[PDB]
Ligand SMILES: *[C@@H]1O[C@H](CO)[C@@H](O)[C@H](O)[C@H]1NC(C)=O
Ligand SMILES: *[C@@H]1O[C@H](CO)[C@@H](O)[C@H](O)[C@H]1NC(C)=O
């Protein structure tokens with residue numbers, strides 16, 4: 686209108702059959718790794734203070750655990766959703782997707798147990 | 805169906821490359837001065 | 841007929857004809873990956889003697905001397921090059 690209020694909610698029209706519910710509270714290098722193993726849906730993240738323009742920077746960083754959901758959803762696909770400001774206005778963003786594969790790595794733990802290099 | 809936005813120019817997506825990426829702690833275990 | 845008839849509970853009847861609240865519970869085991877477990881009780885924290893311990897399901901025996909190393913604040917274990925548990929939070 687100086688405030689930011691959300692009006693139109695186009696995700697789904699509605700539902701009947703709800704089985705689980707959770708509630709909480711919600712420049713950037715936010716590096717996420719999602720996992721779904723034996724129903725247990727583990728996610729890792731790293732929030733890093735970058736300041737640059739474009740395509741993926743180099744550099745290394747370990748990832749920390751966040752949450753384990755003992756759900757039993759067999760997730761076969763996904764998608765990303767954003768929000769728009771107002772005829773529409775999206776923004777200008779970068780976000781990368783690459784599927785992981787069952788590889789094998791060698792890790793270099795230091796005395797601090799920080800992973801300082803892997804090959 | 806539903807209503808959807810138009811005038812959405814689908815520009816063909818492009819590829820990039822990773823650089824030392826996918827390095828996360830595989831488990832909840834501390835180690836020190838080792839290789840695993 | 842009418843399928844629904846009313847109850848005639850009266851206070852001055854026999855205890856049989858007086859009402860009883862029936863709470864049925866049907867729970868599942870070994871299926872539908874769980875979020876409700878059974879209850880649990882604790883014991884104390886003893887150190888510096890040759891004792892048995894059980895932390896986070898990990899079983900072992902030995903002397904629980906004070907530790908001198910700090911880990912990352914999510915890690916629970918601490919292990920050597922020979923892959924034997926020798927530290928725990
Ligand atoms: C979900 O709800 C619909 C009614 O909206 C119902 O017809 C369908 O059987 C339900 N499915 C399950 C798995 O309960
Ligand atoms: C996944 O598949 C199993 C076996 O068919 C089923 O029991 C389970 O409900 C499914 N989970 C979901 C919601 O994807």
Ligand SMILES: *[C@@H]1O[C@H](CO)[C@@H](O)[C@H](O)[C@H]1NC(C)=O
Nearest residue numbers: 795796797798836909910911
């Ligand atoms: C972790 O790093 C700090 C700073 O170098 C150091 O003082 C501390 O001794 C280290 N801890 C371990 C377990 O090596």
